[PDB]
Design an enzyme around this catalytic site. Structure first.
Site, PDB file in Angstrom:
ATOM      1  CG  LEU A  43      -2.056  -1.039   1.197  1.00 52.22           C
ATOM      2  CD1 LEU A  43      -2.875  -0.946   2.466  1.00 52.22           C
ATOM      3  CD2 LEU A  43      -2.947  -0.864  -0.022  1.00 52.22           C
ATOM      4  N   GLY A  44       2.000   1.219   0.658  1.00 57.59           N
ATOM      5  CA  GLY A  44       2.869   2.376   0.724  1.00 57.59           C
ATOM      6  C   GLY A  44       4.170   2.109   1.445  1.00 57.59           C
ATOM      7  CE  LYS A  47      13.633   9.801   8.497  1.00 54.73           C
ATOM      8  NZ  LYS A  47      14.687   9.520   7.480  1.00 54.73           N
ATOM      9  CE1 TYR A  48      10.386   8.406  10.890  1.00 64.75           C
ATOM     10  CE2 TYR A  48      12.325   7.068  11.322  1.00 64.75           C
ATOM     11  CZ  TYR A  48      11.707   8.300  11.279  1.00 64.75           C
ATOM     12  OH  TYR A  48      12.417   9.427  11.628  1.00 64.75           O
ATOM     13  CD  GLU A  50       8.563  -1.946   1.748  1.00 64.31           C
ATOM     14  OE1 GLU A  50       8.470  -3.172   1.975  1.00 64.31           O
ATOM     15  OE2 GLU A  50       8.997  -1.485   0.674  1.00 64.31           O
ATOM     16  CB  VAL A  51       1.695   0.293   4.889  1.00 63.17           C
ATOM     17  CG1 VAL A  51       0.253  -0.079   5.180  1.00 63.17           C
ATOM     18  CG2 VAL A  51       2.282   1.087   6.046  1.00 63.17           C
ATOM     19  CE  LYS A  66       3.923   1.968  11.133  1.00 59.47           C
ATOM     20  NZ  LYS A  66       3.300   2.918  12.108  1.00 59.47           N
ATOM     21  CG  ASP A 154       3.350  12.364  11.905  1.00 60.91           C
ATOM     22  OD1 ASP A 154       3.418  13.491  11.365  1.00 60.91           O
ATOM     23  OD2 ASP A 154       3.668  11.313  11.308  1.00 60.91           O
TER      24      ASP A 154
HETATM   25  C1  V55 Z   1       1.726   4.059   8.475  1.00 65.79           C
HETATM   26  O1  V55 Z   1       1.350   3.556   9.742  1.00 65.79           O
HETATM   27  C2  V55 Z   1       0.110   2.887   9.812  1.00 65.79           C
HETATM   28  C3  V55 Z   1      -0.663   2.657   8.682  1.00 65.79           C
HETATM   29  C4  V55 Z   1      -1.879   1.987   8.812  1.00 65.79           C
HETATM   30  C5  V55 Z   1      -2.740   1.725   7.593  1.00 65.79           C
HETATM   31  O2  V55 Z   1      -2.474   2.282   6.544  1.00 65.79           O
HETATM   32  C6  V55 Z   1      -2.320   1.552  10.056  1.00 65.79           C
HETATM   33  C7  V55 Z   1      -1.550   1.785  11.184  1.00 65.79           C
HETATM   34  C8  V55 Z   1      -0.338   2.447  11.056  1.00 65.79           C
HETATM   35  O3  V55 Z   1       0.447   2.685  12.195  1.00 65.79           O
END
Ligand code: V55
Length: 328
Positions: A43-44, A47-48, A50-51, A66, A154
């Site tokens: 999904l993405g 910096k810290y 990968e999702v 994550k 954040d």
């Molecule tokens: C980028 O961090 C997170 C992303 C998501 C779902 O996209 C759920 C919990 C997280 O901590």
């Protein structure tokens, strides 16, 4: 030196918790079975981490995985302990499991799945009622984590996941979140540029929960005025100049003088002199249906230079802006 500061609420929450609660360095991670989860699509990549979208094959449920990038153990433990402390709270993303990813050799956090729509598209169809509703839902999450002694640090549109169909909201990415301890000095290199509070921008380290309320104000301004982001600086210095062009420089100087803070001399030739502006300035025929006296007053009470002067999450929930929002 700088004048010290304390949160005006939830000041000693962690002081009277048992040490196990906030001492995340001593936390012992309880691992689940990594073979329970199957990655479906990426999904993405931040910096810290990968999702990934994934499937829990023990229930055939969709989940989010994550996988943390290599980072010092205490930051990883920090996020884990915070997620476990806050689990079950209102609109807090639910940590379902923690497994050891065989490839990265790092922890992979498993979360509940939220059927999200991209905020840029969503923020553009949100009605006046939608904005109030979702703001109220974010406030629930923020009062909760603040009441539990934690600041998010954040808050931004990308970290507020909304399933608009079931009108469900989750505050995500607690990787920058921290425990509040009275008079502790914190890293000012947190939050995204556009949502950084003045305290970060003037290098004041003794900040608190009220940071999240500035960020929330930035979100609100972008939503009701239809300008994302609202304060659109090119770097961290220009970011403060953008803010000063709206809130004015005399209140900025009152702020830093109050805490006996000195500005970076770098600002001497870029800051200038600016009057405080009235919020009606940003109202026009394409956003006026999102704006009301209640909206502007609420926004005005969030976006204060002085972190001690901002509405707390709970105070914010009392604001007339939310009178029209249907309570459950
Ligand atoms: C980028 O961090 C997170 C992303 C998501 C779902 O996209 C759920 C919990 C997280 O901590």
């Amino acid at each position: 030196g700088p004048v010290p500061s304390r949160a005006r609420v939830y000041t000693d929450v962690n002081t009277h918790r048992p040490r196990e609660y906030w001492d995340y360095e001593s936390h012992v991670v309880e691992w689940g079975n990594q073979d329970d989860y199957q990655l479906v699509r990426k999904l993405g990549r931040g910096k810290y981490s990968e999702v990934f979208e994934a499937i829990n094959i023990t229930n055939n449920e969709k989940v989010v995985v994550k996988i943390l990038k290599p980072v010092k153990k205490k930051k990883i433990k920090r996020e884990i302990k915070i997620l476990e402390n806050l689990r079950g709270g209102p609109n807090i993303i639910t940590l379902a499991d923690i497994v050891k990813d065989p490839v990265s050799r790092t922890p992979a956090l498993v979360f509940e799945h939220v059927n999200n729509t991209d905020f840029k598209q969503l923020y553009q169809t949100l009605t006046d009622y939608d904005i109030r509703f979702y703001m109220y839902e974010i406030l629930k999450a923020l009062d909760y984590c603040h009441s539990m002694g934690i600041m998010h640090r954040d808050v931004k549109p990308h970290n507020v996941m909304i399933d608009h169909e079931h009108r469900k909201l989750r505050l995500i990415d607690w990787g920058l979140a921290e425990f509040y301890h009275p008079g502790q000095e914190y890293n000012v290199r947190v939050a995204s540029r556009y949502f950084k509070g003045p305290e970060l921008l003037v290098d004041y380290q003794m900040y608190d929960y009220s940071l999240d309320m500035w960020s929330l104000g930035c979100m609100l301004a972008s939503m009701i005025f239809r300008k994302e982001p609202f304060f659109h600086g090119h770097d961290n210095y220009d970011q403060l100049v953008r803010i000063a062009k709206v809130l004015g420089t005399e209140d900025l100087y009152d702020y830093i003088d109050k805490y006996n803070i000195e500005l970076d001399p770098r600002f001497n030739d870029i800051l200038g002199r600016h009057s405080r502006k009235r919020w009606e300035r940003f109202v026009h025929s394409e956003n006026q249906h999102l704006v009301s006296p209640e909206a502007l007053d609420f926004l005005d009470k969030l976006l204060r230079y002085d972190h001690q002067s901002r509405l707390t999450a709970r105070e914010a929930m009392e604001h007339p802006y939310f009178y029209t929002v249907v309570k459950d």
